[model samples]
Target: TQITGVVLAAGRSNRLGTPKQLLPYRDTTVLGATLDVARQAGFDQLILTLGGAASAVRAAMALDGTDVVVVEDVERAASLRVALARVHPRATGIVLMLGDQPQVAPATLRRIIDVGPATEIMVCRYADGVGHPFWFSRTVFGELARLHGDKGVWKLVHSGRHPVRELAVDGCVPLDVDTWDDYRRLLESV
Candidate 1:
């Protein structure tokens, strides 16, 4: 099966007053770290979405394992729809990830795939709660295509439209940069 990874990095960072995707997470930019994970996750194809500061991210961030898709505006669901369009036509499944949340382990993604090879939707059950990286089989693409705003995907998850298989993963949900406080917490953790 052709598994694809979509890293959503196009948010405007309205609360952080800057493009949080450009923030440093480890030895590279925040999106860079996430892309590294996507690489190690063994997806057959990787799609990265960029909008705010798209040009700077394009120039500064490494694009070794991904096809970059630019979204003029980023509402999480909207961005995913844009990225989805760029996914390999042969893709059988898609894994959604966050660019600012660089803490997701490649093992978690492997586990998600292993746990539900046939399930339509799979989400990690973190110590705190269920969170990314979520998986969707090609069968769910219609519902995803209908997604409208930032939280539209959540509606699908919560709607019980698809049987969501939860892969229990250790640790709190990865912190995604949205505000300075989130950035500070992530820094301290690293």
Candidate 2:
């Protein structure tokens, strides 16, 4: 089955007071760290979205093999919708990744795809709670196409219209780089 990995890196980082995607992670930028992981995850397609620092990011990074979408308004849901529209016609599902959360293990990604075809929605059940790398099968494309606002996906996940299959993962929900404290903690841990 063809599976695409969509990384949402378009946030303006309003709470962090800076573009957190540009923050350093190891030897590369934060989103770069995510791309590195996606590159090794064996996805049939990989797409990355940019909004807040699109130009700057392009200048500083090498996107190379992945498809790039410049989401104009920077809404999380809007970015997801835009990226989904560009997915391969043969794609069976998409594994969602948060640009700021580079800590999700690659094994978790492969596991999601391994079990995704059995359900319309597959959530990563972390040690502490549910989290990203959420897998949405082609069966749910109709709902994704109608997404509006930032909470559209979350609403669908919680609506009970479709059963969400949770694949057990080994850690807590990886922290998104939404605030200075979040970034600080990420740096400290890494």
Candidate 3:
């Protein structure tokens, strides 16, 4: 089955007071690192949503080979909708990733995509908790399209409208930078 990778990076960084996606990560920016993982995940299609600092990100990052969707709103659900709209028609499912959470391994994404056909919704069950790199079959695209607000996806995940499958991943949940402390911690982990 054909699969698409969607990276959500449109957050306004209200708490961090800056574009976290532009923050330095490895040899690239934060979102760039996440995009690199998506690039290596071997999906049939890839899309990225950028907001908050769309112009800055566009100027500073390499967005080649991926469909880029820019939304005016920084809401996660809005970004998801626009990206979903751009997904390839042949894609049977999408593996969702967060831009700030660059630690999600490409192998973990491949694992989720490998099981996409069998599940309506799938999430990684890290040692700490369930986390991103969620897999959603086209069956739930309607619901995903109707999602509202930033927490809508998580709400749907636990809504019990569909069976949620959790793939066990060994290790603590990957960190997503939201605050200065979070960014410092992420850098320290490198």
Candidate 4:
């Protein structure tokens, strides 16, 4: 299957109170960490949606194994939509991966990409709720690229006709770095 990975790294990190993308971690920045998993997963092509700290984001990402296309927009949904629209017309599956979720693993990504045509959404469901880095086939790419609300693809999973499949992952749980506290907590471990 032809899968293209899109890393949504455009969040302003307003809650984090700092440029989390530029923040140092594991000898590289947060953007680098996201690229690591995408690269390891053997993504055929990669697109890094850039909005926050454009220079820092481009600098951190090597853009070697995967095609790194950067579009500047503060709204992640906007950037993601734009990026996906560019490739979805030709790509088989647009695998949605969030740059902020450092805890998302490669195995989980493979599962998302490995499912047959029968499966739809391959996601991690917590007691809290469902989440992203899910795979959406090109069949639904037009619907996804046309999302307009402030909210992102979450709407696609919950409010759409598209069927979704679930995959459970433990150990390195979901870590959404949206606040200073969130950033600090992530640093404490790494």
| Candidate 4, superposed: residue stretches over 4 Å from native | 72-76, 88-90, 171-173
Model 2 lDDT, residue 49, Cα: 88
TM-score of 1: 0.93
What RMSD, rounded to one decimal, does every model reach? 1.6, 1.5, 1.5, 2.5
Question: lDDT of all the models against the reference?
Answer: 0.81, 0.85, 0.86, 0.71
Report lDDT (Cα) of residue 135, candidate 3: 89
**Candidate 1 vs 2: which has more TM-score:** 2
Candidate 2 residue pairs in clash (backbone atoms < 3 Å)? none
How many backbone clashes does every candidate have? 0, 0, 0, 1
User: For candidate 4, lDDT tens digit of each residue in 1-190?
Assistant: 4568888777786676667777777887776787788788866778777775667666655656655556655443577667875573456777888787766778878877776234655566655667766877767767777777555587668755767777665554567887877878888873
What clash pairs does model 3 have? none
| TM-score of structure candidate 3 | 0.95
Off by over 4 Å in 1: 74-76
lDDT (tens digit, per residue) of candidate 3 on 119-166: 999988998998898989998998898887655898888867689999
The TM-score of candidate 4 is 0.85
* Clash count, predicted structure 1: 0
Can you rank all candidates by lDDT, best first?
3, 2, 1, 4
lDDT-wise, the better of 1 and 3 is 3
